[PDB]
From a paper:
Nylon hydrolase ([name]) is one of the three enzymes responsible for the endo-type degradation of the by-products of nylon-6 manufacture (cyclic and linear oligomers of 6-aminohexanoate (Ahx) with a degree of polymerization greater than three) and various aliphatic nylons (e.g., nylon-6 and nylon-66). However, the post-translational autocleavage of the nascent polypeptide between Asn266 and Thr267 generates an active enzyme with an α subunit (27 kDa) and a β subunit (9 kDa). Based on the X-ray-crystallographic structure of NylCA, we reported that four αβ heterodimers (molecules A-D) form a doughnut-shaped quaternary structure. In addition, we proposed that the nucleophilic N-terminal residue Thr267 in the β subunit functions as a catalytic residue for either autocleavage (from precursor to active enzyme) or substrate hydrolysis.
His130 and Leu137 in NylCp2 were located in a loop between helix α1 and β-strand β7 (designated “loop 3”). Three amino acid residues corresponding to the substitutions D122G, [name], and D36A (increasing the protein stability of NylCp2) and one amino acid residue corresponding to the substitution L137A (decreasing the protein stability) were located at the A/D interface, and the glutamate residue corresponding to the substitution E263Q was found at the A/B interface.
Author numbering:
A (entry chain A), B (entry chain A): 19 to 259, 267 to 355
C (entry chain B), D (entry chain B): 16 to 28, 31 to 260, 267 to 355
Write the structure that this text describes.
């Protein structure tokens, strides 16, 4: 079991953006994941004054996207089927403004051309992170721009960085909520590349492949984390009577294939986050392809007649995302 | 590890319905689950000539329903937001006919009244089970009627029964596909009741709470089952370059609450079935409430401030469904 | 289209069900045959006089990519597949989905009971509630769907009271003003491009022509005219609150799944011109957009008539007119 | 509504962006003020002359249950919440969603930066692409959304070229025939029942009146008339293939989420009467249906005007006429 990171109770009444001269900081988190994915960059910026942040995945060429918005409490802007960037942020609905900062900077980079085909498209999604801190500072337009400016190829700052600065898990009761973080993982299989990025702020808890609860719902009185279903079932016997994420790959997929891939990978995250896709969550996954590599025409291999196709890619990517969720909770 | 139940390769060219004088059999499966849920009945009937079957959940008063049709290959009829019965069947799209048998018998029971408010509503979903046998016999109208006629309170035939007769799992390669079954589980918490019913015919495999693969993708050469992601990742390194279910409860939920509950419980099944919600699956879950018991107005209890609500019910029901999936694969 | 001004009030509704009768399917001929040229697409229509009720089957043996736009709040749909060998439209409300099983079974038998994934015969079915327009509980069953499929003829469609349209009706602010409609089709070929529209309007609302005249439904026998329903609705409100259509559009122009799905929404929404109100909570409105994927639109959308004049949107506008013509044939 | 027959061709399109200007928000007054009586619902409209481009904000401080019907194939939407304190409509395409952030920020500040879940200020925003109708890259930004919110006045709406409608335009088979539209509103009270419609039509299609006349968009300067786009589309096909609207409808009648969502689809589809074609792949058509949940429909739907005459469907029909009136004010 990891040491606890209890968020502690929120002291409400704290200052907001207008009280500060807010200074973007490039997020470095606890350690840097390095990987090789040409054409993809990541920037993360935060305000210490929150603490809260945004994380921007920039794909300058633009890339086909499916969105799976699955929770009951989704905060999403654009949700486009083609994106030059994905912006994830804290600050609840207010933090969608970070995406406008990214959009504006892309327009300027494009010399303010505005033909239909040249529109710079940014989809943004948010987590509510106001309970995990004592200020009302939200990621703003300037912070979005900073995150884009900080974006570099082949790097991701793990842990408390960017949108993950004040992410937290395990919300049966706030006294047992723990700070998580943001996480990424990367796998290369021949020419195939899969990057997962995740900012888990779940009502549920993070669970590992052995079924151990590793982050969220920590009881200080007992020193142990519990699966929420134990609390829930006891409450019923007694009283009766959000995760935002992206999977980026270079494998060509049709719009239909890509959408089903998104749904598959997203549902797969109920393994590592439990419960998941609840009415209290606004879980949103972006599936993005750079469309560089074809699947073979027939799905066969030494490992099986139906072994090479988009379902197979979905299963592999599902493991990469689990690894990312675990990096976040570490 | 359970003994293998390999489906074996299909011998194609087999006879269909018109070759037989088809005789419904009341399915008893391997053992009977008994439970107490007034107002709910289950019947299961099969044709030995398939073997293939249908399973009918009958709720004569009628009950609010949400449908979560999540796969890429869904075969569904009605999908109504209010149902007097749910009919699950083999026979791929052809087996949707069983539901028409249930509908017709309900109409007759209603003395052929047809006012809007008296329409008898049956939603049906199917699995493709033609690979797991050597005939083209599909559940028909007569078999649907038989299943309804066989329906009794408080009983469910586990295993190879009804729609589960020729269900199978683990389809990276047919040489490793195993027969599953159908399954149910029941929990009562004070006055709250939760029944799960499932017919897993997944491309993926059934996995237990320890992460062990317990049914599907069995390799006769090695005597061991593998998680499909191992086959998939090796295939990629080499070559580059359906589950239908119902959750029935007596807790009142609004249409919005009930729909989100459906999505939550359905995603939860990616724990016990992996992969899940793939393009090759037609996964369909029905969430049905009898609307007999209110949740409290505020969600609080000794176990947490947010511990009694529909998300909490969803987490509990998710465990019941896992238990049902495991009964199916047993 | 010369709509008949004469009323055909459905009239007010313990009638027997199917097995009370020895039901023999009848090949529907309706009031008139539409003839059209669209190889690969066949239509069969069958009814039971004992209803009266019927089914109408579009048979496309090659299979064809399909988008389903199920817009109503009372939809009755089976399959809803993104690829179909047949579309089955039927009366009998939810019970009439059984007709689609008859079609499915017949197609399976024709294949000699082959059941490989690529060989699965896919039929999508949708229904109208037509029990208020008659005094039996007879519905389109397995045998009637099978019969409609067997009666399917290339390049013909029976207009009017035929197949699913036998007891279709419009204008349901009050049943005293509800009129029998029918089914309808219309067809257009524009240099190679073929568009077929099929419609069974059983609307809560009324059928309206291009001039804005109500031509079928909401006939007040005390005035001998048809008003727009909104006039009744607004009077009712002033008083009491004091201070299904199922259709297919089939084309031979290739469209991606995304284009075909938006084409389906566009054509379906366009039917709120010919049927008013439309897409209501009591309607189960369902449109099937089908492409046989025979011919490509040019790579670029240009013509002497504009830079954005040859694309799927343009096809949608054109198909929307073919659908309006079909609605008006049903109401004629 | 007396639509002006005179053309207002947008005309053909390296113009500078926001920071090139010292941008001062202007309170839009348009051509005319609509006045209406609907306590709790305010509208503010602000524009930058340097665009010209604008934002239009509907402010409902109590918060109100909302259904979003995003029907187009090119939708630009932020939030899309099922409960809103404001709806923000803007030009500037995707960049103009930023205006909604200005509104959101202002509302948060008004709350003194309280951030409890129940206190979250919810703004849904949708946009039109209005860059072809002008020669700058100026878009509605944070400051302009904030300004529109500050300018919001109970019971007034500026018709015409104002707020989001400043550079809205219709009829885009070819840009040479595209005309400037505007924004529009209309309001009806029927004994207690209040319905407000707000619309910013930037359609690919054209605005059409109740007689079926094209009144805005697709003006051919060589003929001095407006044809229906389908005439261009079908000629183009014969030749080349040889052998956004964002809107809100606000009412005070209580509707469940299910009813409100079907009400939204019904009213939105009804706009294919006034705008043709509509819901196309190049459109991002988005309608917001909002109820302030003030008054109940009777428990049963009866009246002297029919057994099914007082329900949400009826309200939908009535609101559909208010929306058509709003579309025509925008095109006037």
């Amino acid at each position: 079991d990891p040491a606890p990171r209890l968020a502690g109770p929120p002291v409400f009444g704290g200052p907001g953006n207008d009280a500060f001269d807010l200074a973007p900081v490039r997020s470095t988190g606890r350690e840097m994941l390095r990987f090789d994915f040409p054409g993809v960059s990541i920037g993360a910026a935060h305000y210490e004054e929150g603490p809260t942040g945004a994380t921007v995945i920039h794909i300058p060429a633009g890339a086909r996207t499916a969105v799976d918005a699955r929770g009951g409490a989704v905060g999403l802007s654009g949700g486009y089927d083609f994106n030059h960037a994905i912006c994830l942020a804290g600050g609840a609905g207010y933090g969608l403004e970070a995406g406008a900062g990214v959009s504006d900077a892309l327009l300027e980079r494009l010399e303010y051309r505005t033909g239909f085909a040249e529109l710079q498209l940014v989809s943004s999604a948010v987590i509510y992170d106001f309970s995990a801190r004592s200020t009302a500072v939200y990621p703003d337009k300037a912070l979005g721009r900073a995150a884009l400016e900080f974006a570099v190829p082949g790097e991701f700052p793990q842990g408390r960085a960017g949108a993950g600065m004040s992410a937290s898990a395990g919300k049966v009761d706030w006294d047992r909520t723990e700070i998580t973080g943001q996480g990424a993982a990367f796998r290369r299989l021949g020419d195939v590349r899969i990057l997962a990025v995740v900012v888990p702020n779940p009502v549920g808890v993070i669970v590992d492949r052995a079924g151990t609860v590793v982050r969220g719902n920590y009881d200080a009185q007992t020193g142990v984390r519990r699966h929420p279903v134990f609390d829930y079932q006891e409450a019923f016997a007694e009283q009766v009577p959000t995760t935002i994420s992206a999977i980026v790959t270079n494998v060509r997929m049709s719009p239909v294939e890509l959408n089903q891939f998104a749904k598959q990978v997203h549902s797969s995250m109920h393994r590592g986050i439990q419960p998941f896709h609840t009415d209290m969550d606004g879980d949103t996954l972006f599936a993005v392809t750079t469309d560089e590599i074809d699947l073979p025409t027939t799905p066969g291999s030494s490992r099986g007649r139906l072994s090479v196709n988009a379902t197979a890619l979905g299963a592999i990517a599902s493991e990469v995302m689990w690894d990312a969720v675990l990096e976040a909770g570490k």
